[PDB]
Write a protein that binds this ligand. Sequence first.
Ligand SMILES: Cc1cc2nc3c(=O)[nH]c(=O)nc-3n(C[C@H](O)[C@H](O)[C@H](O)COP(=O)(O)OP(=O)(O)OC[C@H]3O[C@@H](n4cnc5c(N)ncnc54)[C@H](O)[C@@H]3O)c2cc1C
Ligand SMILES: COc1ccc(S(=O)(=O)Nc2nc(-c3cccc([N+](=O)[O-])c3)cs2)cc1OC
Ligand SMILES: Nc1ccccc1C(=O)C[C@H](N)C(=O)O
Length: 449
Amino acid sequence: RQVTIIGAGLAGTLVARLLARNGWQVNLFERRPDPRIETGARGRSINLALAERGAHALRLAGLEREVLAEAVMMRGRMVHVPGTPPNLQPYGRDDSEVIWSINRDRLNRILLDGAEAAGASIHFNLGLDSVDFARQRLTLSNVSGERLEKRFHLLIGADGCNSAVRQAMASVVDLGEHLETQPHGYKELQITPEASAQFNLEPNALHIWPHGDYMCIALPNLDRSFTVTLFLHHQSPAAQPASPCFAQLVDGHAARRFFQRQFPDLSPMLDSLEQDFEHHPTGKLATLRLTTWHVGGQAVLLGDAAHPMVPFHGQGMNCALEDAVALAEHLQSAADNASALAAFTAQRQPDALAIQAMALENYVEMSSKVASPTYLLERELGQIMAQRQPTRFIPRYSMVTFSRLPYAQAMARGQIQEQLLKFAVANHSDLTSINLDAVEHEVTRCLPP
Ligand SMILES: Cc1cc2nc3c(=O)[nH]c(=O)nc-3n(C[C@H](O)[C@H](O)[C@H](O)COP(=O)(O)OP(=O)(O)OC[C@H]3O[C@@H](n4cnc5c(N)ncnc54)[C@H](O)[C@@H]3O)c2cc1C
Ligand SMILES: COc1ccc(S(=O)(=O)Nc2nc(-c3cccc([N+](=O)[O-])c3)cs2)cc1OC
Ligand SMILES: Nc1ccccc1C(=O)C[C@H](N)C(=O)O
C-alpha cells in the first residue's frame, strides 16, 4: 500500500527501493539537500566498511554491482605498531573473504538513484518536526522556515541516530530507552594519495594504529587516499587525570604534538592534520537500546534510528541494510502493518542487541597493541579448531563480518566457543601442552553443525 519514510540515508533509501519494487506507493522525506547536484566541493569523503552482510542486502535490491564498482577491496587488517614490521592479518584462513571500502556519499547517491528508478518519490529539504498519531498527520519544515502538513498511513523512521520519528513515538509510548554513553569521541582526518604512495601504505587493507585508551583507523579510497579516524576520550577520567583527551588538544598544534609523540609512524602521513582537526567537528558515540521499535501499525524505526551503536565492529550500515531487507520482507508477507511491524521487531531486536554488545567488545581487541598470553593462546587454538571443523568452529569476527548468520546466533556461538577455548588454555603456557584431538572432540561435542 502506502508508506511515508523519513530519512534518505542508507536504511531509508534501500527500504524505499524494495517497497517500491514490490509495488508500494512510497514517499521519502529528507532533511538535507539532494546530494546528486554537482558542485565545486571535494566533500566530507567518509569511508564505510561494507561486509558480506551489507553486500547481500544490496544484492537483493539489485544494486550490488553498482556499489562494488567504486569499492576498494580490503583483503586483511594491517596493524601498525612502531618498531614492528606492519603485519597484515588476512581475512579468513584463505582469501576469498573480503571487506569493501565504499565512500558513504557514493553509496547514498547510488541508493537514491535506485530508489527513484523503482518508483519512489524523494523530497529533499524537508525535516520531520512532529507527528500527530491520532489524526495521522506529519509536520515537516524547510530551513526557509515554512511548515508543511502531510497525512500518512505507515511511517518509517529511518532518520538516523537522533531520529525525530523515535522522539515523536516516545511522546505517545514508552520506548524503555537506556542510553549507554561512550567516553570516546572521534575525529576525521585524511591521508592524501601523495602521502599514501610515498609511504607505501597498502591501499588494499584496513589499517589500525592501536594505542590502548585511544587509536586510529584507516580505510582507503579509489584515489588511494585514506580516510582516518581518531578515537580518543573527550575528557581524561578522574583516576588518570593526565591521560590524552580531546580537551587537551585545543588546536592543530597541540594535535600535531599529540600525533608526533603518540603516533610517530602515522603522524608524517597526516599532512593536513592541523586543518582537519580544527574544521571537522569532534563526533560523539553512544549505544542506545529500546524495548519497542513500533507504534501499532503506524510507525516503525530501523537502522540507527532504532539502535545506535559504537562503530568498533564496522557494522552499523551493514546492520541498517539488513534491517531494510527484513522490514520490507515483513511488510510484504503480513496480514497488516501491525503484524508486520511487531514481527519485524521480534526478529531484528535480538540481532541489534547482539551486534551492539559485540561492537562494544571489539574495542579492546582492536585497541591493545600487545594481546595477553591468554587471548593469544585462545586465538591460536581457535584458528586450529577453525581449520579442523569449519562447519562448527567459525571465529566470531568471521560469523559477524564474512557471513550472514543472524547477529544473535553469532553471539551465542561465540559464547560457547570462547568458553571452550578458555578452559582448554588455562594452566597451559602454549599449544605444546594442549592435546588438539581432545579439543576437537569437545568442539564437536559442544557445537552443533
Ligand atoms: C565514525 C563512524 C564510523 C562508522 N563506520 C562504519 C562502518 O565502517 N561500517 C558500517 O557498516 N557502519 C559504520 N558506521 C555506522 C553507520 O554509518 C550507520 O550505522 C549508518 O549510517 C546508519 O544508517 P541509517 O540509514 O539507519 O542512518 P543515516 O545513514 O545517518 O541516515 C538517516 C538519513 O537521516 C536523515 N535525517 C536525519 N534527521 C532527519 C530529520 N529530522 N528529518 C528528515 N531526515 C532526517 C539524515 O539526514 C539522512 O538522510 C560508522 C559510524 C560512525 C559514526
Ligand atoms: C570475547 O572474546 C572472544 C570472543 C569470541 C571468540 S571466538 O569463539 O569467536 N573464537 C575465535 N575467534 C578468533 C579469531 C581468529 C583470527 C582473527 C581474529 N580477529 O578478530 O583478529 C579472531 C580466534 S578464536 C574468541 C574470543 O577470544 C577472547
Ligand atoms: N570501520 C570501522 C570504524 C571504526 C572502528 C572499526 C571499524 C571496522 O572496520 C571494523 C572491523 N571489522 C574490525 O574488526 O575492527
